[PDB]
Design a protein around this ligand. Structure first.
Ligand code: CLA
Ligand code: CLA
Ligand code: CLA
Ligand code: CLA
Ligand code: CLA
Ligand code: CLA
Ligand code: CLA
Ligand code: CLA
Ligand SMILES: CC1=C(/C=C/C(C)=C/C=C/C(C)=C/C=C/C=C(C)/C=C/C=C(C)/C=C/C2=C(C)CCCC2(C)C)C(C)(C)CCC1
Ligand SMILES: CC1=C(/C=C/C(C)=C/C=C/C(C)=C\C=C\C=C(C)\C=C\C=C(C)\C=C\C2=C(C)CCCC2(C)C)C(C)(C)CCC1
Ligand SMILES: CC1=C(C/C=C(\C)CCC[C@H](C)CCC[C@H](C)CCCC(C)C)C(=O)c2ccccc2C1=O
Ligand SMILES: [Ca+2]
Lengths: 143, 42, 154, 108, 733, 80, 30, 108
């Protein structure tokens, strides 16, 4: 059992002068992303989009344009610094969707509450020939 | 000394020596037997 | 003669080519003092030209209307010097090279690090093996019969 | 050097092996060879060089300096290899390349 | 579905510009459309066939209309050798006065294009004489186009849409196609020749009004039924004959003369009628082979099952091939395209050597244009044939149902096949290039006598076998005591031997060492193109680098940078690579043909014979030399009619070069660039009032391979076409 | 979205998950190998199709497969 | 006379109409 | 005008150099064209095709016991690009080289 931490607005954002690498209309009408982390101090870190920003001591909130930017920055926060991070997807309705770490456990560490998806129980060479799924909507790897 | 002979056995060096010898040979053959579209000795 | 050609010894165009070449080199020769080294060089090229055309004429090469040798590769016994004989020589040398290289690869294949001798040549082994190519046709024929030439079930 | 407006500069001669001696063309001065477009004749004339002997001496000096440079490479990698602080002395380097290298070179 | 493309929901849901592009490029790949069935597949194909036929009829109708309404046809018939035919008129408001003047030619009232398709000679030869005849033709073909649309529409409604079982009735379709489509059509064409074309060749104008009054032969019908057919071969046209006239006119309707008409330099019309009649009989009798509804004939399946050699060197032989082919439309399209490409090259090789149309052999720009045309068509058709072999192996091939038959054994020893194609291509390449380079060095060093010039003595011996005397080999037909010479002396051999030993025509042209070398380049191109396509088809289901490739489809970008890197690993990529080699091969073929003929037409055959043995000769004495009039089609001093070919010549050079972009630059560069451009648009005042409905993205990986290949090919074809036509027509000789 | 599948040749070395730049893959428990874990692709709607996972797999042949499929804003990696 | 009608008809009017129409069909949303 | 009055015109010397001392520039003209076109093989293709083809060739060598221990591999994607651009640049530049030198040595 794991309860995703809710996104807390009014969480401070890093010190940064602005860049052309930030959000666009996509964030207004489609979706954007938010990564939060806890920092032990004020540090300089490389922004996945602009140049250099100053991570604030304590909780940090950072809105990014793509999920991959959140995961890249988080990978670095966990690597260069030793910082726990989470990030979420945010729709223009205000709805928030917690994304990562999905279990509260990082996905490279096996966690027992996890259900198999897209797992085929056979060697890859035992997939059927296309002719055997022709005119059916299926793909030989969907089995 | 052993290491130097080893270096001289390496692919590019052995290749330059080998093809340089081959080139001198073919050059001298075309020097004593120039032109020649055929094997004239039959 | 063959293919409507004429022997180069009988070709007017062939002799016209020799003439125009020699007169060209002599036109270059008129510019230098006859004792000078450029002069001796152009004389050497002239003698080499005469040797060339005279040899092509002697050894029976047929000429086209262009006055240039054409080679008869059909196998006609009058022209084996134009392909079949140098061809057998080639196949002997190429078979030599490939047979020796194959001998080397077989010799180093069970070494502890085979690639090590492929980038740094074992020259003693190579020298031991180079003269196997002298008898490569007997060796390869005997291997073909014995079943050592081709890998089994590949 | 006698007749510059007519003779073509040629500094390479080929061996007569396979027919290639045709590349030794008439460049003037009773000389057969390859015409050169590098410009060394105009440099050598501008430097006052007259005889082939002076060119020999320059080739020997150049060869000696090739040996000295090669030696210094081996020496400063294997014997006396400068410290990192030596390289980072940028003010010293710029001062010596401005005044020492370019200045004393141009003056010489 | 919900929007374009309606046949692909995965594409309609794409928010990028890609949705549009891939909607176009996938519109005809019916098997990949949503909710596709076999019945829908076959029915859509069938209707598409009617649509194609309608396009073809409408196109020929247009050509007829334009020749009749803006062309020279009536004037051309009176003087075939001094009237430039007119394709159509030019109304371009961009013309200056000099273009109006310079393009006004062929005896017309304004600017026109000279036709190089050769339809004047064809329509003249088959009996058309007046513009009125051409209009009747054009309206007839417009009618046929309409009825094609009508049938295609009809067979898409139920009770008129056929079952797939009907499409898979192969024996019946073969019987009707052989006996009816091939045979009866040929027989009817012989009819048109003897009733219309031969009379028009003898001065008689036979049309629909009077063709019932006129007899085709004075004794005709009666010697046919008696079985004494030689009365039809009796009185042929005289060797002194004027084609539009009754001078020298005979009465024979079916001959086997064997040569050419001395005036028109083309085949005898009685020869051609006899030909179509005879092969028509062969197709009629051959179209009764297979079994349908009457209890006689063959089961193609049973024949295939029966052809399995004992000793088992072909394993299970041809068992299961009937279903393997009948169930796979890609296998069928592959066989059709392969055969059709072979006979397309065959048409190319036989129409320049044995011209069948009056006064076409003297029009040199037309002969060159047609040969080039059909050779490039044949090349593309061949590459497509192999493409659909590969697509067959991916989509339709059933390994278990073809177990241990010849087809599966192709896959089983694919490395021997591919490796030996590699060997042949390497041998041909090494030695052909080596001999060319040797000869170039000899001519550089001033010693042409040192070249390696190999006589093409085998082909020369074949030409002698045909009765050519240029080489004095004294073999059959070239020798007096040969039974082969005796057997045909009374029939075709006088005309044939007469034609082959005439020095003006292109019938078995004299060949020398230059022909040897280019023939080995051509061998190289056939072998390398074939190597690429065969490796692509046999590795389409998988390789050691991608063993599961069949699961990824015919066309995919790649398999990522893992396992060493996998770009251009798909079968479609093998096609894409092979098209370059085909353009190269047909480039060599057509360079060869056009240079040999342009030297023949100038009486300067020696220039080819001496200059084709070294590559600088090709660069200097063919391309450079014959670009002279072309590149001066317009200049600072004025223009002439060649300007349209000069312009086009550069156009191709441009398009070709543009292709290089898509082929050398790859996607990620452009995707990042476009991201900066999206930022730019959103942050620019007034302009950000305008929003794109589709997210601008860089072209796909495969899409760029296709777009760049298309630019490369369009530039290729248009460049060579401009040079060909300008260099020939500018001289007309 | 691109399809991503795991095959029971998987030995549970976790490298596909470690390589993934959009967090598509997880490690779930399993009894078929010694590491007692097998990969899984529960979030392929975020899959961009870069095949870093495939570059990371040590199994011969691969035990992750990325079948590039219907494109989306997320699969095209668009930040706009 | 007729080319002065049909050349702008199929070289200007027809491409404008076809491009606009195809643009609408391609941008439609159901 | 560039195609005609510059390239077509001024290339006559290099395509007419055979039989003179400038014939080396004719040979380098054609050879540089050759390596430039040769680069297009690398620039237009990709290593997956080549590695598969090499799989068949390797099969042929193992059949005769002459497969090498250093396993043959197609060039890397990056190396494909580097080879490609290197031959493209060498071919183009040397082509213009031969063109220029023949032209200006003859008519200058
Ligand atoms: C004279 C004897 C000598 C000896 C035995 C060594 C020994 C060694 N050197 Mg040293 N060195 C020498 C001279 C020597 N060096 C000289 C003269 C210089 C000045 C250039 C250097 C500068 C130097 C450096 C900077 C380094 C070494 C390094 C090394 C070690 C690595 C092994 C090696 O160099 O393989 C190399 C084998 C070679 C054959 C190198 C050939 C390079 C030549 C000079 C290029 C020739 C250019 C060529 C003409 C281009 C035309 C090509 C055309 C035909 C296509 C090794 C123990 C390296 C090291 O410390 O290893 C960690 C290191 O980084 N050396
Ligand atoms: C299908 C073959 C074909 C081709 C390639 C051409 C080509 C050409 N035509 Mg022609 N035309 C054709 C058939 C063809 N035509 C037919 C069957 C007719 C009716 C007898 C005409 C009557 C016609 C006239 C009156 C004129 C041209 C003109 C022209 C030239 C300028 C283009 C133009 O004005 O639009 C073409 C105009 C048309 C009326 C063509 C449509 C005729 C049929 C119905 C084609 C079907 C079109 C259909 C709606 C779309 C199908 C797409 C495509 C496959 C056709 C051009 C070179 C003009 C010209 O000569 O300029 C100098 C000119 O004035 N054409
Ligand atoms: C001038 C352009 C050019 C050249 C020379 C080649 C050359 C070749 N191609 Mg390629 N190709 C090209 C363009 C070119 N291609 C283009 C534009 C494309 C589209 C991308 C392709 C795509 C392609 C494919 C898909 C395939 C080929 C294949 C081949 C090989 C065919 C077999 C052969 O001819 O034996 C050898 C011929 C040669 C001409 C080699 C020339 C070099 C000789 C050996 C020089 C000898 C070295 C000499 C001593 C100098 C040494 C230099 C020194 C610095 C070391 C051959 C090496 C096929 C293949 O691999 O065959 C097995 C193959 O499948 N090509
Ligand atoms: C596969 C292509 C090919 C082939 C078949 C040839 C063939 C030939 N060339 Mg050519 N050439 C080629 C490519 C080729 N070349 C290329 C690519 C270039 C540019 C680099 C040249 C440039 C060139 C020049 C400049 C010359 C030749 C010459 C020759 C002839 C020399 C024969 C000889 O050396 O005497 C006989 C040699 C031997 C018998 C040696 C074999 C003996 C071995 C070493 C020992 C055997 C022990 C038992 C020969 C017929 C020469 C010539 O005179 O032409 C007539 C000459 O002048 N070639
Ligand atoms: C021991 C050397 C050797 C041997 C015996 C063979 C044998 C063969 N090769 Mg291979 N090959 C070799 C080296 C060798 N190759 C090398 C080094 C390369 C990379 C340049 C290739 C690349 C190659 C290709 C692309 C192809 C073959 C093919 C073939 C087969 C047909 C013959 C042929 O086309 O020759 C052609 C020979 C070459 C293209 C290059 C040969 C290089 C030299 C001349 C030989 C190597 C000498 C070696 C360094 C000796 C070392 C000395 C040792 C004693 C220390 C044949 C079984 C073809 C095939 O698959 O047939 C079905 C084919 O497609 N080979
Ligand atoms: C009777 C002949 C025939 C038939 C019916 C087919 C049928 C088919 N082919 Mg095949 N094929 C053929 C011949 C044929 N082909 C030939 C001759 C070649 C060699 C060129 C190929 C090579 C080939 C490949 C590589 C592929 C197909 C594919 C397909 C399938 C889908 C085509 C599609 O929807 O794309 C729609 C086509 C277009 C939108 C055309 C646009 C692009 C063209 C080429 C540009 C036109 C040139 C330019 C505009 C000219 C104007 C220049 C201007 C300056 C004047 C389809 C079942 C595809 C497939 O589905 O694979 C499974 C596939 O990838 N074909
Ligand atoms: C005698 C009866 C008969 C006839 C006349 C036809 C005729 C035809 N059928 Mg059909 N068919 C039949 C019975 C028949 N069928 C039966 C009984 C079945 C059911 C078993 C089928 C089922 C069937 C299907 C499913 C399809 C056809 C199709 C076709 C068309 C092929 C396309 C084409 O134009 O090629 C014409 C062929 C020729 C003119 C002869 C061959 C051409 C030669 C090889 C090349 C040129 C020769 C010569 C040198 C030309 C000189 C050139 C010069 C004049 C310019 C064609 C008109 C296809 C089609 O297009 O659908 C509309 C198609 O999809 N048929
Ligand atoms: C499908 C092609 C075709 C068609 C539709 C026709 C049609 C016709 N021909 Mg023709 N003909 C053809 C091919 C064709 N022919 C060929 C290939 C030749 C060369 C041998 C001839 C040579 C020929 C001659 C010499 C004559 C005709 C005549 C006729 C007319 C009377 C035929 C008759 O009743 O005989 C009798 C029919 C039968 C006894 C039944 C035949 C059984 C069928 C074929 C099965 C008729 C309208 C005659 C005519 O009046 O000219 C206008 C005439 O004298 N034809
Ligand atoms: C991949 C594939 C495919 C395809 C393939 C192809 C594409 C092929 C081709 C091919 C080709 C393209 C072929 C060709 C051929 C030819 C031939 C086989 C020939 C014949 C010959 C002869 C026998 C002749 C003879 C004669 C006579 C008759 C007379 C005169 C003289 C002479 C001798 C010439 C398929 C789909 C199937 C399936 C899948 C796979
Ligand atoms: C006589 C003559 C001719 C002809 C020829 C022919 C026609 C041929 C054939 C040939 C053939 C048809 C052959 C075959 C082959 C097969 C196979 C199957 C193979 C094999 C091989 C191998 C196995 C090898 C091995 C080796 C060696 C031995 C050495 C080196 C190393 C190696 C391993 C490579 C001509 C006229 C041109 C010219 C004149 C003379
Ligand atoms: C032709 C081609 C190849 C094949 C080319 C290769 C593998 C070049 C290597 C060939 C040389 C000849 C191998 C070297 C052989 C050794 C030097 C031994 C030679 C033996 C003596 C003669 C010295 C690629 O690998 C490739 C990869 C990516 C994009 C495009 C391409 C590409 O276009
Ligand atoms: Ca003739």
């Amino acid at each position: 059992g794991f309860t995703p931490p809710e996104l807390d607005p009014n969480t401070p954002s890093p010190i940064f002068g602005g860049s052309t690498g930030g959000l666009l209309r996509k964030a207004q009408v489609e979706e954007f992303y938010v990564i939060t982390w806890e920092s032990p101090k004020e540090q300089i870190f490389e922004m996945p989009t602009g140049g250099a920003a100053i991570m604030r001591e304590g909780p940090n909130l950072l809105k990014l344009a793509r999920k991959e930017q959140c995961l890249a920055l988080g990978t670095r926060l966990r690597s260069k610094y030793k910082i726990k991070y989470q990030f979420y997807r945010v729709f223009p309705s205000g709805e928030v969707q917690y994304l990562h770490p999905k279990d509260g456990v990082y996905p490279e560490k096996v966690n027992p509450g996890r259900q198999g998806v897209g797992v085929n129980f056979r060697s890859i060479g035992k997939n059927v020939s296309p002719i055997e799924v022709k005119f059916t909507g299926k793909q030989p790897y969907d089995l | 000394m052993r290491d130097l002979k080893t270096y001289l056995s390496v692919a590019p060096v052995a290749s330059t020596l080998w093809f340089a010898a081959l080139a001198g040979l073919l050059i001298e053959i075309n020097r004593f037997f120039p032109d020649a579209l055929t094997f004239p000795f039959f | 003669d063959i293919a409507g050609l004429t022997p180069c010894k009988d070709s007017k165009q062939f002799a016209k080519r020799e003439k125009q070449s020699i007169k060209k080199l002599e036109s270059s020769l008129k510019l230098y003092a006859p004792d000078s080294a450029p002069a001796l060089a152009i004389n050497a090229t002239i003698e080499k030209t005469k040797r060339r055309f005279d040899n092509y004429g002697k050894q029976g090469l047929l000429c086209g209307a262009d006055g240039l040798p054409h080679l008869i590769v059909s196998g006609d016994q009058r022209h084996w010097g134009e392909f079949i004989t140098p061809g057998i020589l080639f196949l002997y040398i190429a078979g030599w090279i490939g047979w020796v290289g194959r001998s080397y690869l077989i010799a180093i294949r069970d070494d502890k690090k085979p690639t090590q001798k492929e980038i740094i040549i074992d020259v003693p082994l190579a020298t031991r093996l180079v003269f196997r190519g002298f008898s490569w046709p007997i060796a390869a024929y005997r291997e073909l019969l014995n079943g050592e030439l081709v890998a089994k079930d590949v | 050097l006698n007749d510059p407006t007519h003779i073509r500069p040629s500094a390479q001669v080929v061996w007569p092996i396979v027919g290639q001696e045709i590349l030794n063309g008439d460049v003037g001065g009773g000389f057969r060879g390859i015409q050169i477009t590098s410009g060394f004749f105009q440099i050598w004339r501008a430097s006052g060089i007259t005889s082939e002997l002076q060119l020999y001496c320059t080739a020997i000096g150049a060869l000696v300096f090739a040996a000295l440079m090669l030696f210094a490479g081996w020496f400063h990698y294997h014997k006396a290899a400068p410290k990192l602080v030596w390289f980072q002395d940028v003010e010293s380097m710029l001062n010596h390349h401005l005044a020492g290298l370019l200045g004393l070179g141009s003056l010489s | 579905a919900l929007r374009f493309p309606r046949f692909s929901q995965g594409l309609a849901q794409d928010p990028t510009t890609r949705r549009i592009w891939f909607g176009i490029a996938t519109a005809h790949d019916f098997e990949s459309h949503d909710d596709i069935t076999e019945g829908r597949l076959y029915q859509n194909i069938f209707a598409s066939h009617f649509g194609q036929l309608a396009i073809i009829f409408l196109w020929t109708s247009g050509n007829l209309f334009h020749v009749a309404w803006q062309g020279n046809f009536e004037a051309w018939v009176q003087d075939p050798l001094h009237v430039r035919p007119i394709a159509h008129a030019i109304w371009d408001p961009h013309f200056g006065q000099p273009a109006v003047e310079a393009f006004t030619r062929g005896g017309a009232l304004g600017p026109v294009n000279i036709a190089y398709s050769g339809v004047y000679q064809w329509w003249y030869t088959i009996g058309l004489r007046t513009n009125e005849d051409l209009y009747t033709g054009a309206i007839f073909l417009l009618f046929l186009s309409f009825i094609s649309l009508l049938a295609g529409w009809l067979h898409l409604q139920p009770k008129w849409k056929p079952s797939v079982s009907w499409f898979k009735n192969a024996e019946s379709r073969l019987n009707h196609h052989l006996s009816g489509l091939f045979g009866v059509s040929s027989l009817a064409w012989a009819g048109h020749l003897v009733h219309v074309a031969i009379p028009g060749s003898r001065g008689e104008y036979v049309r629909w009004n009077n063709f019932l009054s006129v007899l085709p032969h004075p004794q005709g019908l009666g010697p046919l039924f008696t079985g004494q057919w030689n009365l039809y071969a009796q009185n042929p046209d005289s060797s002194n004959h004027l084609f539009s006239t009754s001078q020298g006119a005979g009465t024979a309707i079916l001959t086997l003369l064997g040569g050419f008409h001395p005036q028109t330099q083309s085949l005898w019309l009685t020869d051609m009628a006899h030909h179509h009649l005879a092969i028509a009989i062969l197709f009629l009798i051959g179209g009764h082979m297979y079994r349908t509804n009457f209890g006689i004939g063959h089961s193609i399946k049973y024949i295939l099952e029966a052809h399995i050699p004992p000793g088992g060197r072909l394993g299970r032989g041809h068992k299961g091939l009937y279903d393997t082919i009948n169930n796979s439309i890609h296998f069928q399209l592959g066989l059709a395209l392969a055969s059709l490409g072979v006979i397309t090259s065959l048409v190319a090789q036989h129409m320049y050597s044995l011209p069948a149309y009056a006064f076409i052999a003297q029009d040199f720009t037309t002969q060159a244009a047609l040969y080039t045309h059909h050779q490039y068509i044949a090349g593309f058709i061949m590459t497509g044939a192999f493409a659909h072999g590969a697509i067959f192996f991916i989509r339709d091939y059933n390994p278990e149902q073809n177990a241990d038959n010849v087809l599966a054994r192709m896959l089983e020893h694919k490395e021997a096949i591919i490796s030996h194609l590699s060997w042949a291509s390497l041998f041909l390449g090494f030695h052909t290039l080596g001999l060319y380079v040797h000869n170039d060095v000899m001519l550089a060093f001033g010693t042409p006598e040192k070249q390696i010039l190999i006589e093409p003595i085998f082909a020369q011996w074949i030409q002698s076998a045909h009765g050519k005397t240029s080489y004095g080999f004294d073999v059959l037909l070239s020798s007096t005591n040969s039974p082969a010479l005796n057997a045909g002396r009374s029939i075709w051999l006088p005309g044939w031997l007469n034609a082959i030993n005439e020095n003006s025509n292109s019938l078995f042209l004299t060949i020398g060492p230059g022909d040897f070398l280019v023939h080995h380049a051509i061998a190289l191109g056939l072998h390398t193109t074939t190597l690429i396509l065969v490796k692509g088809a046999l590795d389409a289901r998988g390789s050691k680098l991608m063993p599961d490739k069949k699961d990824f489809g015919y066309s995919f970008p790649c398999d990522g940078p893992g396992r060493g890197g996998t770009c251009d690993i798909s079968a479609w990529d093998a096609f894409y690579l092979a098209v370059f080699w085909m353009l190269n091969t047909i480039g060599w073929v057509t360079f060869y043909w056009h240079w040999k003929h342009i030297t023949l037409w100038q009486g300067n055959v020696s220039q080819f014979n001496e200059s084709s043995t070294y590559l600088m000769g090709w660069l200097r004495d063919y391309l450079w030399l014959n670009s002279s009039q072309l590149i001066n089609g317009y200049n600072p001093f004025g223009m002439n009619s060649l300007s349209v070919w000069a312009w086009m010549f550069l156009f191709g050079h441009l398009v070709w070069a543009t292709g290089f972009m898509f082929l050398i630059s790859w996607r990620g560069y452009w995707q990042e660039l476009i991201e900066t451009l999206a930022w730019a648009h959103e942050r620019t005042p007034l302009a950000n009032l305008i929003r794109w409905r589709d997210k601008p993205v860089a072209l796909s990986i495969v899409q760029a391979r296709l777009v760049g290949l298309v630019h490369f090919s369009v530039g290729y074809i248009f460049t060579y076409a401009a040079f060909l036509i300008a260099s020939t027509s500018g001289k007309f000789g | 979205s691109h399809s991503v599948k795991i095959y029971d040749t998987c030995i549970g070395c976790t490298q596909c998950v470690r390589a993934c730049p959009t967090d598509v893959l997880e490690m779930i428990p399993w009894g078929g190998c010694k590491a007692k874990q097998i990969a899984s692709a529960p979030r392929t709607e975020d899959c961009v199709g870069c095949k870093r996972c495939e570059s990371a797999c040590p199994t011969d042949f691969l035990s992750v497969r990325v079948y590039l499929w219907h494109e989306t804003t997320r699969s095209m990696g668009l930040a706009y | 006379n007729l080319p002065s009608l049909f050349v702008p008809l199929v070289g200007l009017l027809f491409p404008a109409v076809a491009m606009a129409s195809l643009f609408l069909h391609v941008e439609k949303r159901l | 005008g560039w195609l005609r009055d510059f390239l077509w015109a001024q290339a006559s010397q290099v395509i007419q150099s055979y039989g003179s001392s400038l014939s080396a520039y004719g040979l380098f003209f054609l050879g540089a064209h050759f390596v430039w076109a040769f680069s297009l093989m690398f620039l237009f293709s990709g290593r997956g095709y080549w590695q598969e083809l090499i799989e068949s060739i390797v099969w042929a060598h193992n059949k005769l016991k002459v497969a090498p221990a250093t396993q043959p591999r197609a060039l890397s994607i990056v190396q494909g690009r580097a080879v490609g651009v290197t031959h493209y640049l060498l071919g183009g530049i040397a082509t213009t080289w031969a063109f220029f030198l023949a032209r200006i040595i003859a008519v200058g």
